[PDB]
Ligand binder design. Structure first.
Ligand SMILES: Nc1ncnc2c1ncn2[C@@H]1O[C@H](COP(=O)(O)OP(=O)(O)OP(=O)(O)O)[C@@H](O)[C@H]1O
Ligand SMILES: [Mg+2]
Length: 290
């Protein structure tokens, strides 16, 4: 790991600390994550073969001295910062659209190989100057664990967590990433998080107050999930037209099928790509200050 000069601490997070760095041989500019379990080594290593244009490439895995270093392709900005920069104005719809479409291609790819992200959030979505958006940190949650408290005391977000994970479903599927990207999609449109919980019960209860408390009608098997409680308050669903207002009906219709309560009814990434909302999809360039 001495083959890299550290330029700047990009950030810290669940697994470790990310630095911008330079290859002392190549001159290649990379993101170097400093995170070892053998199971975790083999799984990280098969992720190296998961290449796709909307997936941040894992250049190399440097395992030395009980220390693990993940060297990724570097991108100049994440979606959280692009969003904070665009607050006043909002992200134009055609770019939101391009972004959702490309993230769906990324998910269709990984899901077809049976790999889930499990932790999608605006900081894990990286963008460049040509209009591309890529998923970062795919596969890592299953390969190492997803802690309560991110490494540097920071608390991983729950705002994007699917309801079956919150209800203690042990074997959740690729549908959990479609739930999370739906919540991001909504947030790009409105400029405000859809479900900002600050705890697991608050998270749940914020989902219940917009989409209605789920029951055996909308979701067969829900009432015998491990953290389901018959004492949960019964709240009615609200309409999407109030939820993500500006969005047109193709957009709300796609969003509502991404937010289905039952993960077997939730749209897959491959069906979502054929949805009529994407009929006029283009690829615009964003306005970016590096
Ligand atoms: N490949 C990369 N290129 C450029 N910047 C990156 C890259 N990967 C990560 N960063 C940015 O570095 C910061 C730290 O990323 P990090 O993975 O540690 O945290 P996170 O995405 O916020 O949470 P999590 O640990 O769950 O991934 C975030 O701002 C991330 O967007
Ligand atoms: Mg990350």
């Amino acid at each position: 790991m001495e083959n890299f000069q550290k330029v700047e601490k990009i950030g810290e997070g669940t697994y470790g600390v990310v630095y911008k760095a330079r290859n002392k041989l190549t001159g290649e500019v990379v993101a170097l994550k400093k995170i070892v379990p053998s199971t975790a080594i083999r799984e990280i290593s098969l992720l190296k073969e998961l290449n796709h244009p909307n997936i941040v490439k894992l250049l190399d895995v440097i395992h030395t001295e009980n220390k693990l270093y993940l060297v990724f392709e570097f991108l100049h900005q994440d979606l959280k910062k692009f969003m904070d920069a665009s607050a006043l104005t909002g992200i134009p719809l055609p770019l939101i659209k391009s972004y959702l479409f490309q993230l769906l291609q990324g998910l269709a790819f990984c899901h077809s190989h049976r790999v889930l992200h499990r932790d999608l959030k605006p900081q894990n979505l990286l963008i460049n100057t040509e209009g591309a958006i890529k998923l970062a940190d795919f596969g890592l949650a299953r390969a190492f664990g997803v802690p309560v408290r991110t490494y540097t005391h920071e608390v991983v977000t729950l705002w994007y967590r699917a309801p079956e994970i919150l209800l203690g479903c042990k074997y959740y599927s690729t549908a959990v990433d479609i739930w999370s990207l739906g919540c991001i999609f909504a947030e790009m449109v409105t400029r405000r998080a859809l479900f900002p919980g600050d705890s697991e019960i608050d998270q749940l209860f914020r989902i219940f107050r917009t989409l209605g408390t789920p029951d055996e009608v909308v979701w067969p098997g829900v009432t015998s999930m491990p953290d389901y409680k018959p004492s949960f308050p019964k709240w009615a669903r609200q309409d999407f037209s109030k939820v993500v207002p500006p969005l047109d009906e193709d957009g709300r219709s796609l969003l509502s099928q991404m937010l289905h309560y039952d993960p077997n009814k939730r749209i897959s990434a491959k069906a979502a790509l054929a949805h009529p909302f994407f009929q006029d999809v283009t690829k615009p360039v964003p306005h970016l200050r590096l």
